[PDB]
Amino acid sequence: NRTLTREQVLALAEHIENAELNVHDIGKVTNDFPEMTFADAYDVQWEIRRRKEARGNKIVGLKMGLTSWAKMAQMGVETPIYGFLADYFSVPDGGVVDCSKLIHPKIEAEISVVTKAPLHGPGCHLGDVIAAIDYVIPTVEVIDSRYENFKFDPISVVADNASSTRFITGGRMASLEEVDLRTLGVVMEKNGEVVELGAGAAVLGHPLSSVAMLANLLAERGEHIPAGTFIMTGGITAAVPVAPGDNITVRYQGLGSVSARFI
């Protein structure tokens, strides 16, 4: 189920990573490799992860993307995708994000979890996930595809680490039993006014179902979710462009707010 040579996997990972590291867009890689498969793209993504680990970056988490019924159908896929989170992606509550290091960023409000027991697929279900959740973390993702004008496809997007670039944590980081992730209301304000809202159910019907799905996806490569993993479960709100000068505040029902400023 692969079409790339090893040399191509290595060179594509360099090419795609350089676009993020040097803040420029690129053509979608499937233009040059039309036969590229999901396994190829994940090969490329995991190689970019290796490149970052090799230079000393810690991988502090994983994210899930295309977690909407609408999102999957737009992309012609039947399942979500995942990507990894490097330590320098992390931004503190109330922090300042430098847009000069971003290409064409947008923000999404999400809910994250940190696990306290390993999770394995295949066949991981909602019931398997519950006790493995330590606590939840209100999180705003900054997504920033390295493909120009968002002219892409899901295979290219996987290869580009699912557009990951920054994430901002904040609010109250509470045990799972204190929080209903299905009914969790989230309100995104930008420049002083409400611009988007949503509920946790927008994530596959339940954000914990996204965690179960992630375990199953990882199992396809013989991987799993180790205890202690931070997982961003998916977009609760629609993605919103951000630019220098913007202030955002995202309010999480019963869990405070997450804020950031852009320059």
Ligand SMILES: O=C(O)CCCCC(=O)O
């Ligand atoms: O849902 C995500 O977090 C990944 C989205 C990747 C595609 C995009 O850049 O819009």
Ligand SMILES: [Mg+2]
């Ligand atoms: Mg650089």
Ligand SMILES: [Mg+2]
């Ligand atoms: Mg996201």
